[model samples]
Target: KRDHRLLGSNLQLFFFDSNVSPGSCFWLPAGARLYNKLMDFIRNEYRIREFTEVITPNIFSCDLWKTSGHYFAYKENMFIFDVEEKEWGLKPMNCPGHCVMFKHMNPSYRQLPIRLADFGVLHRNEFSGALNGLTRVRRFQQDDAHIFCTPEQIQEEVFKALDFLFFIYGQLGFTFDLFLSTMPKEHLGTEEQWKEAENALKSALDKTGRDWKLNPGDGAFYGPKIDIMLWDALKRQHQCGTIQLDFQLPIRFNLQYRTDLKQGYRRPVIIHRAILGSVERMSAVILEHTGGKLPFWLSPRQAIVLSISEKTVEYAKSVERELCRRGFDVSGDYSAATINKKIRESQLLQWNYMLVIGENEARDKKVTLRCRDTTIPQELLTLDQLILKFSSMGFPSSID
Candidate 1:
């Protein structure tokens, strides 16, 4: 059984030093690549999904949470403190911050369905003993987005989010179970509002034609939700996705948009959603899911050039530069070591491709290509041929 924690360290991805910061991760270079690439993936999807990325403050005065009604319901989970005799805290979520932006704009119904995405960091004061590696942390970031639209448009947005989530999961090779969570006993909204929200979620889930169960009284304090339980190889499940419907946040924040001549003004419902619940935890799930066998585009060690001896050191470096210049993560080993030992270490380090440069191969303007997976047979290719082969093995794409 390989714990993600152990794989994180052995792969030089991420690690924890309790003495420095408990429940916090030190993302090494390889780890950072995974983190950023996941973020980048969401960003690309947002563009197609009609969401605008926004930047917001990670820390705000306690009044912000109070007006958002989170200070009372979620105060204990917040990292609160006195700032110059005034109460303040780091935000545990991006909803309130995004609400501020929406209220600031106060667009009309024509500008309705404003989709805002924030990749901002959040902090929650977890009990020291409850801390877990990336999964449960004091600090983390999410692909958090909030949508404000008329009640009539709720189903379409929820459907779009589901469509987007399915596409993303397909790309990452993760299968999950879905659950439609209903209003809790101690929720904030009225019976009518909550019923409406729950119906919208249920209706959308049904239209998707996927298997899902009811999670009665398991919704957020503000709304009903759709929860995702991503299952790993070992049958471990992580709640890595959520889409919550909030009729309360808008009312609490007095969020409204000018309506047509029929009505003076109308309140917009809020949808708080995320695909990768937390970037850190998602990285952990992905690392263990693939067993550290990263895809080419996402792999840090895309390829490494090894020299057979001193005579081929220069040739090895040239090959490294050729791939490196083409935006690939390429490296070289020109140390005074035998080719077999270097190749062994390269495989151990999970290099996707090992390009061995020898005197004869250098003279022939070709190199031997050894892949990380033992099942793949070795091949010989010239510089142009290798580049062509790599070009065909490119990255993810967007849907118009």
Candidate 2:
């Protein structure tokens, strides 16, 4: 079955507790590990892309939303509450907070293309009826970033953002259909501004040399954007990544950057982008896409060391320790069970490798390697040889 919720339960990854909070997830140990791994992957990209990661307040004054236009436009989806007769709202998006951070710095034109990244948790009051596994939740974090740049930098910044998005999706073996989403009926910017933003996006798309479809009137209220739709195993299209160009947020927030040309100060354009969109939703996509068998590098349980008998338990522990020391996520199964039974359990859990230690193999200081791919025959190899083989194999082709 391709149902991620059922697979998540079988893997003990994540679960919903209606008692604690409806539409929220309690990520178990395995799920947290996978989630952190994905976050780390994005963090590494930030370093390469020269993005400054920030942690902003999850709850802000309702006045901030009013200034950002969410108070009137997006209030219904916001989780609003009152404290001591003062109104506040849980953030449904990080853009407004990021805008505050940008203004706080009093930025200059020298800092054009200021990329700020955040993985902060956000809350939205989605109808309970619409909630599903990780794909749709009340609370989640995104690999979200906002780029503050000048109008002249739109094309370059957009090209770079699109490149980054394709690189990540390519690594995960995902192909997407690109769409140029134009201005909506109820939008923030003027018609002239929207046309300019739409043309800029179209120019970038053309330079990509990839076929794209026009998604008329499907953009966010604040801007026009590029929507990336990926098809899953069930042939269902899921919109996971987006690159949006905004000319209105800075105007509403009164953000400006000092410049020597023109008026000595100019409004900075904002590029709102996300490659993985929501980390939670991406996790579900990955689980279902790979049928619970994640890539070796991303696997929570990378390898399982099984002992043929209790006599070989110590050897299995030593193997596990060495693998762990070498930065491999490994575990030892030394239960009082048959070797076949242990192997079956390991396979069921989708471990990448099964290191079998038996009488002859332990005597020879070698291990019998059985890979998840059953077609490959088992082989006897030393510990160093096993590590070398895995290292050369790198990431699995199946998931990559």
Candidate 3:
């Protein structure tokens, strides 16, 4: 099996050094680009899905967690300390923070299904022995969102969430195994609440017409949930996404919204959903899934301009500039190395396309475009032609 850590190192993506931070990674420039691109991709979906993005505090008073029941149930996995004789702790998850945000305003029925999304940094106290690369880290961020909706809107909101999740996973060429986890034996909410939440989840899952197994008593303490298990190239399963229906948090936080029909205040149920559970773990999955060769839209360096000789250096620079101007991620290689050596280096980096600039091509104001896959034959084209070709290609059909 090819380890993601080895692939990350080989591709200059990210690194972990215990001297600076244990179980945390320093994302190099390439890794940062990929990370930012992934976030941007998710943000695009937010615009279409009508999700309102928000920023939340990373640290909070322990009282907030106490109200959410995490102080007692989840304190062991949290990093807590005291300041001014008052207990404080870093957020292990975004749920409580989001609850605070939801409580920040007195919402009306019009804002019933208020979707608050966040990509904030979170920390947990993972055991030293259990910490692994990006998959298992002390610090990470999630593509996390909480949907505050009326009890009647749970089915619609859940269907929309399922649609969004499947669309993204499908784009990445992933097929998933669905599972519905029912209430745990020692859960926070009452049996009536669990039954309603569990039935809502089942209704949504059934509407999708996909096969899903029931995992009784496997849900979080707060409520029942639907878990998505994705299989990678090695046939290894990773739980990358979740859709938890929580009736406990709102009641705990006393989060309510005014309803026109009822002419009174009512508790808003929360649908906690994360398409990419952890950004760091998703990066690892993508690395191992494609063996470090990301798709064109997500690749850090889409293409590289290589000069065949010293005389073509200026032209190569111009080619790089043009591609960048056209909104493409491109780099130029003007080092004192043979053209073959430069090509090899670009290939090793897994750049999508290589534009070889040499004497004849430079003089003719043309480019000899080479696809990274050897099966695709080289094509001779002008700068304009190259740009047009790239624009038409868009994202690749498959990373493989």
Candidate 4:
């Protein structure tokens, strides 16, 4: 009964403006609600996983990318501007900025495997014909993180990233496959250097006992990479997440930290990773996967209260307010529409619960809950109980 395209449009979740540009989405109120909730969930997860969240500028000097090797290969797709006499470009990825951050302070070996995570906006141009809703956007937000560690610490740090990805995807109900990508033909650095980096990634995978398919000569231009691919509702596969191994960035950015007993400073390995590749692309994948009937946990409106007549308006308001106070996202509607019409509207919006608060519910202090497939009677569900019950039922299951 539910379809992604129709449901997305009907709910007014997100839209693309052709006049402004291609491959970019203007997220509306509903979309923002879902986005923020997802961000909070991810932040909580990161906190539990011992990741330090960091914020960075949207644009940086051209020299930064020049040193990072992105300027030479990716300059055409970047959005650049001149300020006074200096040229800056919108960052397509967050790893280089993190490299600069790591170099800002000299650190001891105690700070090995320093991880920094960022959910920042990024920009890159894409042909109009290549744009597809939120799947291929010119402007997007990336849930990117960079891990700086010594070569000896590579396996542990990479295993952590891979483990996090696997856990999050499982929680989100995603069944995915992994791919290890090798050096690209247009890559920088030497072949021997690339082999060492790729082997490090392989060692990490081996240590974690994760089986991944290999893609020869298909990595990012700067280094070897790992891609997480999953199939959506229509059985279409999408590369929605990645972890990359970077050796040259540390050298170019002059990133180094002192070791416990080593002379001078030593370069640290860099692992760039993202769980939800890009917010734009992941949003598209989520919509399609759930066919727009998002699980209750992430649904914009967990419930809608509809009154059958003017006499029940006050009751409806009371129910709505009660749910809101209990931390349940809900709304009240007393538009004098027929009961059937209200139910239809709630269905169209794909609300997790439809609470019909008529005169009877008001008098008895009990409400009728219309679930996705069934209706139930409840007499004052406690705040915690309500939340637990709904969450257990998979309300926004993929979210937390």
Winner by lDDT:
3
Query: Tens digits of per-residue lDDT for model 3 on 207-232?
Result: 99999999999998877888999887
Candidate 1: residue 23 lDDT (0-100): 78
Q: Which residues of candidate 4, in runs, are more than 4 Å off?
A: 1-6, 182-200, 207-210, 216-222, 375-400
What is residue 49's positional error in candidate 4, in angstroms?
0.6
- Each model's lDDT: 0.86, 0.86, 0.87, 0.78
Task: Please report the TM-score between candidate 4 and the true structure.
Answer: 0.88
For model 2, the stretches where C-alpha displacement exceeds 4 angstroms are 183-192, 216-218, 260-262, 388-400
RMSD in angstroms between candidate 1 and the native structure over all alpha carbons: 2.4
Which residue ranges in model 3 land beyond 4 Å of their true spot? 184-192, 261-263, 388-400
> How far off is residue 268 in model 1, in Å?
1.3
Q: How would you encode candidate 4's per-residue C-alpha lDDT over 1-400 as one tens digit per residue?
A: 3454455678888776788766777678888888876676677778777789999888889998888877988889898899789998999888888887887856678977788999988888777778767766788888888888877776677777888888777766787888888988898767877777778778877877767889999998777888889766677788878888887787788777877723588778788888987876777678777777777767787888889889988877877887788777788789988998999878877788887777777677666677755554543543345556665754222234
Lowest summed lDDT across 10 adjacent residues in model 3 is found at 391-400
Clash pairs, model 4 backbone? 23-137, 23-138, 295-396, 296-395, 296-396, 297-395, 297-396, 298-396
**Reference-based lDDT, residue 229, model 1:** 82
Better of 1 and 2 by TM-score: 1
